[PDB]
PDB file of C-alpha atoms in Angstrom:
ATOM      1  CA  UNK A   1       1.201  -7.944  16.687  1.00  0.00           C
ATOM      2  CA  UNK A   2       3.362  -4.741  16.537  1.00  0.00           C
ATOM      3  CA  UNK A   3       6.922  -4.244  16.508  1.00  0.00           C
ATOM      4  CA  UNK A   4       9.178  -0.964  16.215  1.00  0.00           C
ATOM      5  CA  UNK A   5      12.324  -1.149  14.188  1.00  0.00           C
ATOM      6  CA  UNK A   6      15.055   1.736  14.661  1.00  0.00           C
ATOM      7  CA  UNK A   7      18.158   2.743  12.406  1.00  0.00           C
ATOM      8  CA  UNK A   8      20.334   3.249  15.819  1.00  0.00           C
ATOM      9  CA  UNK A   9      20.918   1.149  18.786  1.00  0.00           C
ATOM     10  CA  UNK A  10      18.601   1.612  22.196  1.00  0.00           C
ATOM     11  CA  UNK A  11      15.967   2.695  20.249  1.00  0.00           C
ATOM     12  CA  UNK A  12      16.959   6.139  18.659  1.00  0.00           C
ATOM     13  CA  UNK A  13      17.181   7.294  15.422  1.00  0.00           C
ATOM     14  CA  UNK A  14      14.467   7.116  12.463  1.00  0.00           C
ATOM     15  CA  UNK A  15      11.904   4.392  12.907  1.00  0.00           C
ATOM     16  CA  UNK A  16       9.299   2.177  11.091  1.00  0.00           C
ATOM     17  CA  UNK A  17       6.239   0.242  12.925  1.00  0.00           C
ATOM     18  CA  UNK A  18       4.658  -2.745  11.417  1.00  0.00           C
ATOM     19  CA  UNK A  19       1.468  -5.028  12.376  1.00  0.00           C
ATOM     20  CA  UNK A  20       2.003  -6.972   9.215  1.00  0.00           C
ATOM     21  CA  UNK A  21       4.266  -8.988   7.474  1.00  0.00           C
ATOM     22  CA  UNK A  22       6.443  -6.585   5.097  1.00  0.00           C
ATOM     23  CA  UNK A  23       8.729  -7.594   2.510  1.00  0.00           C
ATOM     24  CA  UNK A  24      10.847  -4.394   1.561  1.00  0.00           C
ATOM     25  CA  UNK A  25      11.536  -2.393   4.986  1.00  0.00           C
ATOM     26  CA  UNK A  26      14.058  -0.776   2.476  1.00  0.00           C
ATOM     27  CA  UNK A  27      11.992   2.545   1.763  1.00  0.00           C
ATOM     28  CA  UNK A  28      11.443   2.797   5.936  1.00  0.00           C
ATOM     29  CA  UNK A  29      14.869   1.848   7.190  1.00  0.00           C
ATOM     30  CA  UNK A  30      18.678   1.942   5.479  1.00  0.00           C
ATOM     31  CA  UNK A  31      19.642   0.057   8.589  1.00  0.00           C
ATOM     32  CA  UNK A  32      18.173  -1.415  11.906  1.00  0.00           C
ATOM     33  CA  UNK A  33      20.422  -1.902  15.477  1.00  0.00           C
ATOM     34  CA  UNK A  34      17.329  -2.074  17.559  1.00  0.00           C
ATOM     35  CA  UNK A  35      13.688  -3.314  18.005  1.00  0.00           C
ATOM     36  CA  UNK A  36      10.644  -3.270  20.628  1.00  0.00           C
ATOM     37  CA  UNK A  37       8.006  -5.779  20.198  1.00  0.00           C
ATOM     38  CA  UNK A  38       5.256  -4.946  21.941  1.00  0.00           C
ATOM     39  CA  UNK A  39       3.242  -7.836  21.070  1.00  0.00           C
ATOM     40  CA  UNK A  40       3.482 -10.994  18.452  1.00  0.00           C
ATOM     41  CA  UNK A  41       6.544 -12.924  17.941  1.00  0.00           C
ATOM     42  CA  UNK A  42       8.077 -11.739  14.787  1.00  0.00           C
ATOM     43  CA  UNK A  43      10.939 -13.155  12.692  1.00  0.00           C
ATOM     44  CA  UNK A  44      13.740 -10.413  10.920  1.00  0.00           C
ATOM     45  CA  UNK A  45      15.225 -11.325   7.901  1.00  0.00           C
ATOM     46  CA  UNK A  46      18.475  -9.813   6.011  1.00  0.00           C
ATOM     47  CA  UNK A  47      17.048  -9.402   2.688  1.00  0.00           C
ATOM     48  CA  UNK A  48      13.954  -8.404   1.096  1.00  0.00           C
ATOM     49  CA  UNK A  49      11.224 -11.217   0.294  1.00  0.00           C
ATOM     50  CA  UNK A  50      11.763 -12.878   3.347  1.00  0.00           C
ATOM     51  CA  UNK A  51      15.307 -14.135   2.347  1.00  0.00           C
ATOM     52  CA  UNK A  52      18.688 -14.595   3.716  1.00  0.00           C
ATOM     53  CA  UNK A  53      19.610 -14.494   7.100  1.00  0.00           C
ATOM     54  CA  UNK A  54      16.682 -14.905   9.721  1.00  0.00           C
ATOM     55  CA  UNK A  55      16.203 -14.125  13.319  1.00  0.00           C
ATOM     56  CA  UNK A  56      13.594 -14.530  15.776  1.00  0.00           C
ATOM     57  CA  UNK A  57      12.058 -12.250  18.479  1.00  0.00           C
ATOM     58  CA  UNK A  58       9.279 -12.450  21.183  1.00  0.00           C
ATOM     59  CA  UNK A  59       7.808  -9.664  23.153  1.00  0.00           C
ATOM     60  CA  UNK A  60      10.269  -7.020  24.826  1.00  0.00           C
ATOM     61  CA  UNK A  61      12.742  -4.459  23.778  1.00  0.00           C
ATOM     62  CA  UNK A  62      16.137  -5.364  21.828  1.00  0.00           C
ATOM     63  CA  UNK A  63      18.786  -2.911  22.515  1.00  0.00           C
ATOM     64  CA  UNK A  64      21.091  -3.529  19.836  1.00  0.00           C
ATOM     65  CA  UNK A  65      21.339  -6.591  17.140  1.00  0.00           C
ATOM     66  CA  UNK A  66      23.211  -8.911  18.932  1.00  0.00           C
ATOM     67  CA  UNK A  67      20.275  -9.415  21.348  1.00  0.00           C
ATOM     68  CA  UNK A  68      18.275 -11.054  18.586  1.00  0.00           C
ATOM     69  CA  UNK A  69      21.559 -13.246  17.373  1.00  0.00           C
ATOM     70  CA  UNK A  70      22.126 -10.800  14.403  1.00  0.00           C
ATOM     71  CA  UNK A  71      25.170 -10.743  12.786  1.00  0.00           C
ATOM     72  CA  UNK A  72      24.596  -7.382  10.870  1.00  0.00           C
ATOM     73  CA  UNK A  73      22.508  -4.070  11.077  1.00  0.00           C
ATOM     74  CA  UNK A  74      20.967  -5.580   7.773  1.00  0.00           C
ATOM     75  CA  UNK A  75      17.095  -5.737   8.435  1.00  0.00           C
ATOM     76  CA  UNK A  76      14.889  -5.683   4.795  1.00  0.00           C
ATOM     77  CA  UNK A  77      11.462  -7.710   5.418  1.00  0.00           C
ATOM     78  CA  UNK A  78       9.971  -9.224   8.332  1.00  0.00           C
ATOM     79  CA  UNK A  79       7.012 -11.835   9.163  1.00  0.00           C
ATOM     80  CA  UNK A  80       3.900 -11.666  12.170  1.00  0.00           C
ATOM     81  CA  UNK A  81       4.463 -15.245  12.986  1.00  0.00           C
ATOM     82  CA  UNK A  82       0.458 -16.113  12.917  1.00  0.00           C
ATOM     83  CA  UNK A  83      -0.984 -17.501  16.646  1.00  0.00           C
ATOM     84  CA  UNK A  84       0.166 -21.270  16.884  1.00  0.00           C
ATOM     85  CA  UNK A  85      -3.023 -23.331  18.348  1.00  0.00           C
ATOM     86  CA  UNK A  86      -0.936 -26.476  18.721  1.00  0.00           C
ATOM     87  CA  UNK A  87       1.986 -27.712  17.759  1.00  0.00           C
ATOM     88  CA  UNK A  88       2.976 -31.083  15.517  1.00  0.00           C
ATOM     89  CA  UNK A  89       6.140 -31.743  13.102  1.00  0.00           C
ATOM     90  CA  UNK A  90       7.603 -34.217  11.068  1.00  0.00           C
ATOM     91  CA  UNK A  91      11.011 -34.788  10.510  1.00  0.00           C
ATOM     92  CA  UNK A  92      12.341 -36.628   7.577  1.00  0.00           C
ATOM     93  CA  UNK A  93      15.957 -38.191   6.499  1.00  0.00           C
ATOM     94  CA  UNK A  94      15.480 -37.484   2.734  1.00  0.00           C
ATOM     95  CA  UNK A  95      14.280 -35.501   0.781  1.00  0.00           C
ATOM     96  CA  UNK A  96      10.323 -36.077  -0.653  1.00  0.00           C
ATOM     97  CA  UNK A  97       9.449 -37.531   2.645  1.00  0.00           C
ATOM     98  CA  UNK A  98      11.276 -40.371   2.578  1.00  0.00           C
ATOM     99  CA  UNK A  99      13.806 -41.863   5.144  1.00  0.00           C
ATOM    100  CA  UNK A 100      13.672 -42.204   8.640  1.00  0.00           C
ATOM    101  CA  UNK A 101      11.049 -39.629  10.221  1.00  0.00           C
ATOM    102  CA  UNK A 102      10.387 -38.565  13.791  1.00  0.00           C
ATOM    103  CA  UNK A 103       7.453 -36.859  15.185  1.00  0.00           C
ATOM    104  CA  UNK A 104       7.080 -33.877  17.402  1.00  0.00           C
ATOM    105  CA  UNK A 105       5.349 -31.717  19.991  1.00  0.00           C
ATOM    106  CA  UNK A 106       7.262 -30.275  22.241  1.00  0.00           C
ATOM    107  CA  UNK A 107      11.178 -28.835  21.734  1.00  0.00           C
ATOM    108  CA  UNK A 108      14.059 -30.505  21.106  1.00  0.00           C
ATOM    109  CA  UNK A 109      17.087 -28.816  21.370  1.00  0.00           C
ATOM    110  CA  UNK A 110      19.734 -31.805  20.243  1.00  0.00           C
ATOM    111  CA  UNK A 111      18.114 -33.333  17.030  1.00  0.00           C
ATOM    112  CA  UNK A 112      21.298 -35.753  16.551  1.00  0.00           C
ATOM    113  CA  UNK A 113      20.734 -37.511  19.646  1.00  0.00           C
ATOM    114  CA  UNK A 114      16.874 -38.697  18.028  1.00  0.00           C
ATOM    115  CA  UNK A 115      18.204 -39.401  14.445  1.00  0.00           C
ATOM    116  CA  UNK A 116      21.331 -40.305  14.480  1.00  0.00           C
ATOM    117  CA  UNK A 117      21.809 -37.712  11.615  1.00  0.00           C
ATOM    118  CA  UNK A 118      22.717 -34.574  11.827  1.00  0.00           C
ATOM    119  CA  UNK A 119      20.614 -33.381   8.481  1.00  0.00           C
ATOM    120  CA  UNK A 120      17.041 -33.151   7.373  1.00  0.00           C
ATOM    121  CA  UNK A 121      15.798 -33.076   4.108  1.00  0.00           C
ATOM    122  CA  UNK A 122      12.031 -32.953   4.309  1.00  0.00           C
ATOM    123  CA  UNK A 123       9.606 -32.138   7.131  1.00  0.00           C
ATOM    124  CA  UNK A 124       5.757 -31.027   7.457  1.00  0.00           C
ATOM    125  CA  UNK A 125       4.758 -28.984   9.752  1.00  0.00           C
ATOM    126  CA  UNK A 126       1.264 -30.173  10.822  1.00  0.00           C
ATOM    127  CA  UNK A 127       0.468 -27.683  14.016  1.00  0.00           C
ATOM    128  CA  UNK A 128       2.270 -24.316  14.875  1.00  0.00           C
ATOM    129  CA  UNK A 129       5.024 -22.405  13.869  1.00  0.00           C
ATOM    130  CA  UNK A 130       8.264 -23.734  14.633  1.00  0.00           C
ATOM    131  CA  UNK A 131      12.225 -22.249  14.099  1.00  0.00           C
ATOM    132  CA  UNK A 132      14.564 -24.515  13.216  1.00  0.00           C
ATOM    133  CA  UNK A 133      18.289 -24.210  13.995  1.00  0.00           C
ATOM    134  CA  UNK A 134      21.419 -25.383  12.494  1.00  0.00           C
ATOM    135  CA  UNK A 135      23.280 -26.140  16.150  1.00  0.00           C
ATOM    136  CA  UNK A 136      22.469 -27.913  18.483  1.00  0.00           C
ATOM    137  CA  UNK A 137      20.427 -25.439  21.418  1.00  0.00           C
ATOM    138  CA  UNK A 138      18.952 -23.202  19.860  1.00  0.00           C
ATOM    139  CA  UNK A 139      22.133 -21.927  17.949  1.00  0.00           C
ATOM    140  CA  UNK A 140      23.519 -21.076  14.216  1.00  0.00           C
ATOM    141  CA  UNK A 141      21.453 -20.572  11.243  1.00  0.00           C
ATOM    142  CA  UNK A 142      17.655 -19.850  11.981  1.00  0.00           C
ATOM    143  CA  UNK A 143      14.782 -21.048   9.796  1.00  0.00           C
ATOM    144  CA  UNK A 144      11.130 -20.176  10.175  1.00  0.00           C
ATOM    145  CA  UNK A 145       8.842 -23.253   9.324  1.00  0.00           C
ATOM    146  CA  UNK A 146       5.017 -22.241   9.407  1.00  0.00           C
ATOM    147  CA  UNK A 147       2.350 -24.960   9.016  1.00  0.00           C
ATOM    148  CA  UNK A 148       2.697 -26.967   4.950  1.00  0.00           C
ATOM    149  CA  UNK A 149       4.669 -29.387   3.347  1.00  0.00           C
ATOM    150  CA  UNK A 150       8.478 -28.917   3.182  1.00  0.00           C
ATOM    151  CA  UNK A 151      10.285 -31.034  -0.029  1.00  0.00           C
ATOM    152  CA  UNK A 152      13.839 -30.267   0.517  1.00  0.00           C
ATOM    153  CA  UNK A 153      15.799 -27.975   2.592  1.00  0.00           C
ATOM    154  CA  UNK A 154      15.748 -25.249   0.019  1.00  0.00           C
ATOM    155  CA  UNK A 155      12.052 -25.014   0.749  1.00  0.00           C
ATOM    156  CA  UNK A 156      12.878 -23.369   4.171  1.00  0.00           C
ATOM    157  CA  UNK A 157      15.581 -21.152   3.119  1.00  0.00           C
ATOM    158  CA  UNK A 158      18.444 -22.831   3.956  1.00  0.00           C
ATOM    159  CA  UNK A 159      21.986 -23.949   1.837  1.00  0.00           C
ATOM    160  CA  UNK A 160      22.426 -27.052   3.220  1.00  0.00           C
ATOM    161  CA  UNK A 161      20.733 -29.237   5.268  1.00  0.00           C
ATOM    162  CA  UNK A 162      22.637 -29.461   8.750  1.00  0.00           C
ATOM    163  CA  UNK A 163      19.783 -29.047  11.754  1.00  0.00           C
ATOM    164  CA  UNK A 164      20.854 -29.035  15.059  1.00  0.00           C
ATOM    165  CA  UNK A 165      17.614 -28.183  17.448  1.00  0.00           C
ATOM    166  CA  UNK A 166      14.159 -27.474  16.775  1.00  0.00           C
ATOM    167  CA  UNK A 167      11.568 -24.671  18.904  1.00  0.00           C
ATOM    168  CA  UNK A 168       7.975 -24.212  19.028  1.00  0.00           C
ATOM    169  CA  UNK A 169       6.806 -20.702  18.465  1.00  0.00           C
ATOM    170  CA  UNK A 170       4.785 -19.600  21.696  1.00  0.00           C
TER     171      UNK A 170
END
């Protein structure tokens, strides 16, 4: 993978590459308003340590924040999503695994109309990397989930619980 992260929009100002995974992007860039990934899919994240606000982005060239979802020019660590060979995921209604769970391959972008719930509080990922979202089609909060076990909704970053939709990372 390889993406190119710039301080200004449409791709100007001081720069950074990465082919890796990099937790503190703050030595490389005060800011970031655009990106060009050339290859990988790649997920931004506000804060260092792969915390905080998270975005996702495929191949192609991102002319200013908003074209990834951002809601800031805050970009401090980012992750090379690893090659997905398939892709499974469970879905649990409580916490620890417990409660209703659903099963999937393939995307689902209204999770409410399946559970009857509109949070989860467990899930393994079995196959592939997946980003969850907080609305319904593809909307709101991201979360990256990456093949393991998931306890509570903590575990994947997020505040609360609310999932709306659910994507397979191709």
């Amino acid at each position: 993978g390889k993406i190119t992260l710039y301080e200004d929009r449409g791709f100007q100002g001081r720069h950074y590459e990465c082919s890796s995974d990099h937790p503190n992007l703050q030595p490389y860039l005060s800011r970031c308003n655009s990106a060009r990934v050339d290859s990988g899919c790649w997920m931004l994240y506000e804060q260092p340590n792969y915390s905080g606000l998270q975005y996702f982005l495929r191949r192609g060239d991102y002319a200013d924040h908003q074209q990834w979802m951002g809601l800031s020019d805050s970009v401090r660590s980012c992750r090379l999503i690893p090659h997905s060979g398939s892709h499974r995921i469970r879905l649990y209604e409580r916490e620890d695994y417990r409660g209703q769970m659903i099963e999937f391959t393939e995307d689902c972008s209204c999770l409410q109309d399946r559970f009857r719930f509109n949070e989860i509080h467990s899930l393994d990922v079995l196959e592939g990397s997946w980003v969850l979202y907080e609305l319904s089609n593809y909307r709101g909060r991201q979360y990256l989930l990456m093949p393991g076990d998931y306890r509570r909704y903590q575990d994947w970053g997020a505040t609360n619980a609310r999932v709306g939709s659910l994507r397979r990372v191709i």
